[PDB]
Amino acid sequence: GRRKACFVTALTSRTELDIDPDKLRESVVELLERHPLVFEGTRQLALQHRPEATDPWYEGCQRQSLISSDSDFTEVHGELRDTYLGEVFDRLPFKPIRTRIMALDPKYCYSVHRDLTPRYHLAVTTSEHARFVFIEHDKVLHIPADGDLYYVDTRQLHSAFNGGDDMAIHIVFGTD
Amino acid sequence: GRRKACFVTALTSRTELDIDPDKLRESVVELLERHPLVFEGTRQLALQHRPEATDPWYEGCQRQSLISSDSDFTEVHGELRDTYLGEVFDRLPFKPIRTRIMALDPKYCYSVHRDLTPRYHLAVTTSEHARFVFIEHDKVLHIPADGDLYYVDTRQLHSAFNGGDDMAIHIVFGTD
């Protein structure tokens, strides 16, 4: 109750990163061959882990209430340094936490709800059929796979849907 | 095109029908026990048929390109006249055509697209997670199961999603 809904223009913001969409997509496709997304509907893979984690690829994918603190998930996987995903992390203007690849299945949507913390999104694979829907703000948002980073305030009441035939995939960064 | 997008307030309109939501819902649930919805994702059952149809419960559910004319599907099924669904038809202020029960699976959405003809909607079972999303108009719409009839202009670019755990069900009426 003490925080109120944001003004509509504060739902999103663009930070220019100049990432190459083709190289980004091919690096994600190759990575998922070796480290598959877990879960169904909304699927996930962790790109940052807690120091000394024995389950670095999936620990950070647990539901928020099982996460001690997002800020513990600081370590980019060592093997990413050599690939184009290492280049993505190098270009970030902030220190990310609990970064995950996150995906929406084809023809899938999730419940209208509020998240606890907004994140930054880099779209990997998407289409005109994949959108965020903000219910109180009556605003529809599409995040293009243009190599730029988009803040998206998913604390606001919202759903997301993917009406396409192919899965929609983002890299989703936290910050502190 | 010669027809342009409608103004945002013309996306929907309410016609008061005073139908009882509980009797409506219980009559539809019982009917679907005896006559199954066909298709997946968007599921359908026809409530009106062409004269002398051999497949009256399902001919009207074929895709629009296989429909000769919506206006041929004029006859309410005989077995409906003495149930509450017959009462619904008796109250309509227009002559309906090609009326169908239409439903969206849980966690399902369909492609962003345009339909050829707008319809009138009577929501049977729904939740806050089921919405129409108008892309060009940047408008989100919920049709409540309040016993009233809602025009929805699905000729406009749109998707629909059901983020809920249960199937969302409408009766969908055409008219001349």
**B26: part of which helix (H) or strand (E)?**
helix B21-34
CB contact under 8 A, A111 and B164: yes
Whether B2 maps to a domain, the answer reads no
Could you tell me the two tokens for B15? Answer: 């016609």
- Cross-chain CB nearest to B133 (options A108, A111, A140): A140
Closest CA to B143 of B20, B18, B43, B14: B14
Question: Using CA atoms, how far apart are residues A170 and A28, in angstroms rounded to an integer?
Answer: 10
Q: Which residue has the tokens 């950070």?
A: A60
Contact present, B146 and B96 (Cβ < 8 Å): no
Cα–Cα distance, B78 to A159 (Å, whole number): 41
Instruction: Report the run of H or E that residue B84 belongs to, with start and end.
Output: helix B84-91
Q: Is residue B3 in some structural domain?
A: no
- Chain B residues 102-121 with a CB less than 8 Å from chain A: 107-112
d(CA A34, CA B112): 33
Question: Helix %, strand %, coil % for chain B, to 5?
Answer: 20, 35, 45
How far apart CA B71 and CA A37 sit, in angstroms, is 48
Show the DSSP H helices in A7-91 as ranges.
21-34, 84-91
CA B13 to chain centre: 15
**B101 token code pair:** 């029960």
B42 is a domain residue = yes
In a domain, A1, yes or no: no
Cβ burial of A69 (10 Å; 0-12, 13-18, 19+) is exposed
Report the residue of A161, A162, A166 to disrupt the B interface, i.e. the one with the largest count of B CBs within 10 Å.
A161
Q: Sort out which chain A residues have CB atoms less than 8 A from B159's CB and list them.
A: 129, 131, 161, 163
Structural domains in chain B (count): 1
- Closest by CA to B164, choosing from A142, A134, A159, is A159
The answer to whether the beta carbons of residues B43 and B74 sit under 8 Å apart is no
CATH number for the domain including A103?
A: 2.60.120.330
CA atoms within a 13 Å half-sphere pointing along the CA-CB vector of B40? 2
Distance CA B174, CA B20 (A): 21
Dihedral sign, CA of A99, A111, B116, A164?
A: positive
- Judging contacts by C-beta atoms under 8 Å, the chain B residues touching residue A110 are 107, 163
> Using CA atoms, how far apart are residues B16 and B21, in angstroms rounded to an integer?
13
CA dist., res. A67 & res. A59, Å (int): 9
Segment A50-53 long-range contacts (CB within 8 Å, at least 24 positions apart): A50/A74, A50/A75, A51/A75
Asked, for residue B90, whether it belongs to a domain, the answer is: yes
State residue B150 phi and psi, 5-degree precision: -125, 115
Residue A55 belongs to a domain: yes
- Of the candidates B158, B50, B164, B167, the one whose C-alpha atom is nearest the C-alpha of residue B101 is B167
Inside any domain, residue A33: yes
Q: Answer whether residue A3 is part of any domain.
A: no
If we measure between CA atoms, which residue out of B46, B22, B28, B42 comes closest to residue B145?
Answer: B22
Q: Which domain holds residue A115?
A: 8-175
Q: Which residues of B touch A128 (CB under 8 A)?
A: 112, 135
C-alpha separations of B149 from A130, B94, B122 in Å: 29, 12, 5
Q: Please name which of A7, A48, A39, A14 lies closest in space to residue A152, comparing C-alpha atoms.
A: A14
Obtained via which technique? Answer: X-ray
| Dist. CA A114–CA A152, nearest whole Å | 12
Contact A143, A101 (CB under 8 A): no
Distances, alpha carbon B94 to alpha carbons A13, B56, B153, B175, in Å: 48, 21, 17, 7
d(CA B161, CA B152) in angstroms, rounded, equals 15
